[PDB]
RNA sequence: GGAUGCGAUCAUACCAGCACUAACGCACCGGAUCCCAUCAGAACUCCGAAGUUAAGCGUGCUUGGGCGAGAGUAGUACUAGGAUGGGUGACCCCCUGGGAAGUCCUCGUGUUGCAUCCC
RNA sequence: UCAGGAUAGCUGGAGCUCGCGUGCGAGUUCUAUCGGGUAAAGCCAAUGAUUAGAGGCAUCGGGGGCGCAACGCCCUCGACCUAUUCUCAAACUUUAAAUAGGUAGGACGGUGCGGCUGCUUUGUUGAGCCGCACCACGGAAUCAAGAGCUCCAAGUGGGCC
RNA sequence: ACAAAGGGUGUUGGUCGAUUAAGACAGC
RNA sequence: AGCUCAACGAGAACAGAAAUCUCGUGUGGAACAGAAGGGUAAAAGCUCGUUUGAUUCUGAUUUCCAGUACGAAUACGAACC
């Protein structure tokens, strides 16, 4: 019974790129596009709930792609958002369920080429970061809750972003 | 149900009497028409008059 | 406008309350329930006395508010604003009809006329603490107030400490040995149960009164 | 003119001038309603009884 | 129909146990019902199927037919001068095996050695069992008695926990 | 602040479902459609094939429902065909396919209907249904697959398909066993052979010592230990098969029960204990 | 004394926070050629046995919440039957009977069937 | 169809089948078993309605003071959270009576063998039914001016207390 | 084949208080 | 067959009370055509695959009730799916 055992390292689960963009149409499309180019992996488009006039949108409307990217290019992408950062997170980034995440304005920080076309396209990072054992929640046989002491903490995730990155967090 | 009670211990008249052996179902059965009768422990000098 | 109050004082309809079967019901008249230093601490007022009632009949929402504004005035002229607290304890919650007068008894279902009040033998009516010093003047207040009310009512002086539910020497008693935990007006009884480091040191008893 | 409308009002006092009667039941119900293939086999089965 | 539906005023008879909504237990369908059974009908507002009319609910009747899924009860209902012996079929989920003549087997075979033993010793018994009767006189030892007296009136006490 | 969400009251209204759905055990849907018999056919109990795959072992069961609960009337384990020579690879079809067949050959003994009805000794991958002899029907029971989800190929079916061999009567289709092609509504008897004999297992090996011999031995290393190469593992499994048929009766174990049971768990603390313990935390907190 | 597979009852079994567990197990866990599956080998499916009891499962504690039982509330509220009973009435006493429910207090925190295995 | 009629119920006449206390019965109790949501009660339990204060909280409310501002500070009233609190429901309710409702208390019973089936079972495994043999003091109280069955038909279908 | 809320220093019983033979209340 | 709803808490550029996305809690406080009341959580709700038991034959029963009919519904039997 210690911290040290091999079983509680923390790593990253997934990363989930996101992009909300209002409308639907040629934008979405190469939203997708380009998330697909950046992930190697076809997007998913995300429907619209509710129906609201000031922004826009319509009910079952497809008003964003978001894709899911897990193992070595779910790392590398992480590595250059950060570094697109310059290694640096708000103190309030990171949840109390051991998950953080950020934002860029433009996609091009991140190694693609400018079109003119295409245009320039935000993206949002969401990182989250898991113990070994966390299956037990996700199967589906004997489904059952991940103890709070195995649990990604809010100190754990800002350790684990301090030590691996070298990163700076601020209060602002 | 006071008529069907009167009828099943045999009291049809005013003022007719008859004997009742104690029991839990007799004695429940005659609390029901209780404002109707009046009814004691009766001596042997009284059976046998 | 308003019916004489004795055509509705007798309790012969089921509770009809205002809700989304019952709509287009006029406002009660008695909107103020507490008056006088409502905010008074409850160590500062151990007398308390009850206005009863004795009958079983409807109080109108108007004759309420007449009561309260009676009490508090004869109160405030007496004993002063700041030397008493009055609580009206009962809440006019069933809606009065009127069939207004097609013709006939036709579909005579009336419309909402007023609020009251159902009253049972033996509920308090108005309550009123005070110091001691000001127990006649609460009596008298209470009898003023008698006046603006249907049937008979009985002026009773309560063994209770304040509007607490503990009587004068148990609440002395409970207080003695820091058992009592002054909550507003109302009082808390300090049990034995709960979270143990919850309670403060000296506030944590093995057993219960 | 408008009349009454309804009442059950002396009619328990007509059902008990003759009833409650309650049939007399058999030894031997009818057979009617029950599963079809069960009767079937138990007519076939008295037939070579 | 003629005014009143089906399920008319069964707000309250076929609404389910507080607390035991939800999956039906395993035990309800492993019963076993055999014709002449004694069975209690109780509505389980979950199943719509073989639903009983609601006037069948909380009576008691007599198995008389056994199909797959339901079972046949013949149930007593007054009409007028006369009652009829209405069959209904019942799904086995509203239904439940009655304990309304569990003691009569029991009193028949104890009533059957009774007699057997009486007749072996050359007795003539009456196994009939009878209603509670007086019970003879007895001695009770004196102990320390507590008077009691009324209780002088005190209009502070007429209300629950005081006035 | 934020309200509480597991309030009082939340817990006054909350009802607590049954305990194996509460684990996440039992879908009482399935189980109780499977159960469920019809009132005309009394008290005939319906048998169903339970068939369980644990991280490292298969479990094989008959049973039956009672109020009581759940009676076995045979069961078969994975983990007792190192017996029968089969060592590795517990937890494959092949091994799936094996502890069916045992099982099979195990209530057939136990209702002396083993002679009436032996399958096919020789597995084969077409589909099979024992054919009802002249004396009495073959033995029946339902597969009780459970929470897995059924897809082609799954071990349930190659466990379904041992069975079957081992001449039981279990209802069923061709659309699931290993081999069937979605594109093609027809099984291939090849493939299903070749996966009941473990020669998936065996490309496999093929492929990773051809490949990778290092991440070869990491994954095969159980199977190097015992010696086992990819084309042995056929004949492997025909000995297995056939020690299964020629003696399928369940050993007994020769160890005898402790004459004490240790205790490893603490155990309740009793009244007074409590309240010693009460009595001293309160006195601590009170002298501060 | 337990674990596992299948269950019965379906909270005395649930929820939250802490502590502990020999062996076999159950697990976490390593991969994606094959069957299978998705945006995602996360899940599902298949093939495994390098590592770990960190988590799950199990057990124990909390003047914990909930839940269950008792005491009390209280012969109170209510109620079947009676009166040429009181009262202007509202309502209520009495006679022959039945008889609840919050608050407060005390206790308890699962019991079990078949099969396999460890001790 | 609404001052009417038919229809069922209530009634008469005619009987018939049996019976004499061993009673196929009962507007009654007893015993054992079931169902209920009214009275009451509850909100300190869900839904809805409703009074008052007490203790804390905000980069996100209206104000006062210290201030050019400040994610600067101190207080007032509001929201918010916590533990309390007055008063409520025909179309609310955890709980939940009294009275009343249903079922059963043998001769149409039980036990042991054998037999029939095209139904059912892996299985003369069950499910019904049928024969043989034995036992069965009448299987709670009270009453029973008796019980059952059928035919033809009158009047009534304004009620009222 | 009616009577209410409010009242009475009419009279008749009860309940809780105050003063009094170190002398109660009214007049000298 | 798979999944779990409303709502809330904490996070993520534009983005805010309200767009999409991540985790946690979540006894149904959502949804189930319509009035209301019941009922439902590995479902009766949402998504997807395959389909036409919204099929053929007459009988029985329940509700209404005179124990008539119609409407509606329920449980078997005999076929084809
Ligand atoms: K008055
Ligand atoms: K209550
Ligand atoms: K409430
Ligand atoms: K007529
Ligand atoms: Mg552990
Ligand atoms: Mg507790
Ligand atoms: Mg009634
Ligand atoms: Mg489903």
């Known amino acids: 019974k210690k911290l040290s055992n091999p079983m509680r390292e923390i790593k990253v689960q997934k990363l989930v790129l996101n992009i909300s963009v209002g409308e639907s149409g040629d934008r979405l499309t190469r939203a997708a596009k380009v998330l697909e180019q950046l992930s190697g992996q076809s997007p998913v488009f995300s429907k619209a709930r509710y129906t609201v006039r000031s922004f826009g949108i319509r009910r079952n409307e497809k008003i964003a792609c978001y894709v899911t990217v897990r193992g070595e290019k779910a790392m590398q992408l992480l590595e250059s958002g950060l570094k697109v950062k310059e290694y640096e997170l708000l103190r309030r980034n990171f949840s109390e369920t051991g998950c953080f995440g950020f934002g860029i304005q433009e996609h091009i920080d991140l190694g693609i080429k400018y079109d003119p076309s295409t245009g320039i396209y935000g993206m949002d990072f969401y990182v989250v970061l898991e113990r070994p054992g966390y299956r037990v929640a996700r199967r589906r046989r004997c489904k059952a809750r991940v103890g709070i002491q195995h649990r990604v903490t809010k100190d754990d995730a800002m350790k684990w972003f301090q030590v691996k990155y070298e990163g700076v967090i601020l209060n602002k | 149900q006071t008529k069907k009670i009167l009828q099943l211990l045999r009291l049809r008249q005013i003022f007719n009497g008859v004997f009742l052996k104690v029991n839990k179902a007799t004695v429940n059965m005659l609390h029901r028409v209780e404002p109707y009768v009046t009814y004691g422990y009766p001596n042997l000098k009284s059976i046998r008059e | 406008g308003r019916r004489p109050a004795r055509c509705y004082r007798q309790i012969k309809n089921k509770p009809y309350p205002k809700s989304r079967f019952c709509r287009g019901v006029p406002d009660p008249k008695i909107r103020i329930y507490d008056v006088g230093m409502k905010k008074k601490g409850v160590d500062e007022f151990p007398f308390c006395v009850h206005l009863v009632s004795w009958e079983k009949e409807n109080v109108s929402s108007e004759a309420l508010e007449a009561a309260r504004i009676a009490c508090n005035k004869y109160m405030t002229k007496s004993a002063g604003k700041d030397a008493f607290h009055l609580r009206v304890r009962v809440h006019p919650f069933h809606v009065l009809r009127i069939n207004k007068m097609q013709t006939g008894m036709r579909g005579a279902f009336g419309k909402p006329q007023g609020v009251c009040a159902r009253v049972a033998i033996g509920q308090v009516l108005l309550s009123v603490r005070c110091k001691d010093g000001n127990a006649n003047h609460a009596q008298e207040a209470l009898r003023r107030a008698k006046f603006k009310f249907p049937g008979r009512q009985k002026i009773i002086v309560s063994r209770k400490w304040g509007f607490t539910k503990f009587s004068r020497t148990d609440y002395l008693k409970y207080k003695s040995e820091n058992r009592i935990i002054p909550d507003g007006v109302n009082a808390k009884l300090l049990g034995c149960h709960g979270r143990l480091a919850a309670r403060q040191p000296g506030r944590a008893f093995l057993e219960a009164v | 003119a408008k009349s009454k409308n309804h009442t059950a009002h002396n009619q328990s006092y007509k059902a008990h001038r003759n009833g409650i009667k309650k049939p007399r039941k058999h030894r031997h119900s009818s057979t009617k309603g029950m599963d079809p293939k069960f009767l079937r086999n138990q007519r076939y089965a008295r037939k070579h009884n | 129909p003629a005014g009143h539906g089906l399920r008319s005023r069964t707000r309250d008879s076929f609404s389910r146990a507080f607390r035991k909504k939800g999956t039906i237990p395993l035990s309800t369908y492993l019963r076993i019902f055999k014709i002449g059974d004694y069975v209690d009908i109780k509505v389980n507002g979950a199943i719509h199927k073989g639903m009983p009319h609601k006037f069948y609910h909380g009576r008691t009747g007599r198995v008389w037919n056994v199909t797959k899924r339901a079972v046949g009860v013949e149930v007593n209902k007054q009409v007028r001068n006369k009652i009829l012996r209405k069959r209904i079929h019942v799904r086995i989920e509203h239904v439940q095996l009655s304990r309304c003549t569990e003691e009569v087997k029991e009193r028949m075979k104890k009533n059957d050695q009774l007699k057997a033993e009486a007749k072996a010793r050359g007795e003539v018994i009456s196994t009939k069992r009878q209603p509670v009767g007086p019970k003879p006189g007895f001695m009770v030892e004196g102990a320390t008695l507590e008077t009691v007296t009324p209780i002088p009136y005190d209009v502070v006490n007429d209300l629950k926990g005081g006035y | ?288």
């Open chain 6, 1 to 288: 602040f934020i309200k509480v969400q597991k309030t009082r009251a939340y817990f006054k209204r909350f009802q607590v479902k049954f305990k194996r759905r509460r684990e996440g055990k039992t879908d009482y849907r399935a189980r109780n459609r499977l159960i469920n018999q019809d009132k005309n056919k009394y008290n005939t109990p319906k048998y169903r094939f339970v068939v369980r795959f644990t991280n490292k072992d298969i479990i094989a069961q008959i049973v039956s429902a009672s109020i009581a609960g759940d009676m076995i009337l045979a069961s078969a384990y994975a983990r007792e065909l190192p017996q029968y020579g089969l060592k590795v690879g517990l937890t494959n079809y092949a091994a799936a396919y094996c502890t069916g067949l045992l099982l099979a050959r195990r209530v057939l003994k136990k209702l002396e209907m083993d002679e009436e009805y032996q399958g096919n000794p020789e597995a084969s991958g077409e589909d099979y249904s024992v054919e009802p002899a002249e004396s009495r029907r073959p033995f029946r029971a339902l597969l009780d697959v459970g929470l897995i989800r059924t897809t082609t190929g799954n071990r349930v079916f190659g466990a379904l398909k041992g069975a079957l061999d081992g001449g039981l009567d279990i209802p069923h289709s061709e659309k699931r066993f290993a081999g069937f092609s979605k594109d093609s509504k027809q099984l291939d008897a090849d493939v299903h052979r070749k996966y009941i004999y473990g020669g998936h297992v065996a490309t496999y090996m093929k492929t990773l010592t051809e490949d990778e011999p290092e991440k070869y031995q990491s994954h095969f290393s159980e199977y190097i230990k015992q010696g086992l190469e990819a084309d042995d593992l056929e004949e492997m499994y025909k000995k297995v098969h056939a020690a299964i048929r020629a003696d399928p009766s369940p050993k007994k174990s020769e160890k005898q029960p402790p004459k004490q049971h240790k205790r490893y768990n603490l155990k309740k603390l009793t009244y007074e204990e409590r309240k010693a313990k009460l009595i001293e935390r309160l006195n601590a907190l009170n002298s501060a």
